[PDB]
Ligand binder design. Structure first.
Ligand code: SAM
Length: 212
């Protein structure tokens, strides 16, 4: 009942998906793509967004897969989700703390609700498959605006769902996003050569600050 995700160095993250009492969350494909993206040279010492010793907030962590990966890369990570997912997050911190080279802790952060502030804006905010929640889009973007500063690197990874109401929900997300943020799509050629998909996008989001 463990989902496994292997790092570039052969070490292996292990993620439980069921917490006792109905509460649970699976590891989503977008979390695998973003996690393995964090292991590309882009987030190494000689890279554009070195992760080691930097502050990282993850929203909608679920199992914690992405934030845990960042913690095995030297970041000081806070993984967050709803109250009911805190037990699962703590279990997965326990299963992977032997691989953590930075730090990792879990906190409740329900989108739209103000929580324990950072002393200064995080260096990164990470999100995997956080966007198809129509009812929580304005809350999510409020949290993002409240926490990020002009230097925060916001990385948003999501699997594009092409059927149903999802195309519509996706457009509402971007229309709300553009009021306060810029974005830029990371070309597929920069994802992990193995763990990528034309259906799974990575976008860098930045708090807008125009000179005009
Ligand atoms: C599709 S899952 C993705 C989980 C994980 N990031 C991954 O990719 O494997 C979305 C996550 O967002 C969380 N979430 C949904 N609405 C939320 C809200 N209003 N506030 C905080 N978290 C929320 C869910 O509990 C769930 O863990």
């Amino acid at each position: 009942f463990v989902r496994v995700l292997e790092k570039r160095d052969g070490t292996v993250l292990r993620l439980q998906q069921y917490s006792s009492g109905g509460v649970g969350c699976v590891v989503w494909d977008a979390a695998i793509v973003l996690s393995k993206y964090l292991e590309t040279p882009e987030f190494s010492g000689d890279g554009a967004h070195a992760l080691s010793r930097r502050s990282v907030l993850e929203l909608g962590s679920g199992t914690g897969a992405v934030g845990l990966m960042a913690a095995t890369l030297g970041a000081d990570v806070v993984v967050t989700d709803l109250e009911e997912l805190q037990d699962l997050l703590k279990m997965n911190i326990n299963m992977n703390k032997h691989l953590v080279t930075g730090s990792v802790q879990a906190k409740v952060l329900k989108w739209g609700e103000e929580i324990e502030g950072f002393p200064s804006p995080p260096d990164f905010i990470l999100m995997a498959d956080c966007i198809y929640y129509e009812e929580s889009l304005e809350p999510l973007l409020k949290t993002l605006k409240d926490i990020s500063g002009f230097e925060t690197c916001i990385i948003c990874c999501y699997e594009q769902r092409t059927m149903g109401k999802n195309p519509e929900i996706e457009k509402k997300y971007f229309e709300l996003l553009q009021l306060d943020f810029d974005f830029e799509k990371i070309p597929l050629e920069k994802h992990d050569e193995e763990y990528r998909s034309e259906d799974i996008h990575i976008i860098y989001i930045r708090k807008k600050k125009s000179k005009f």
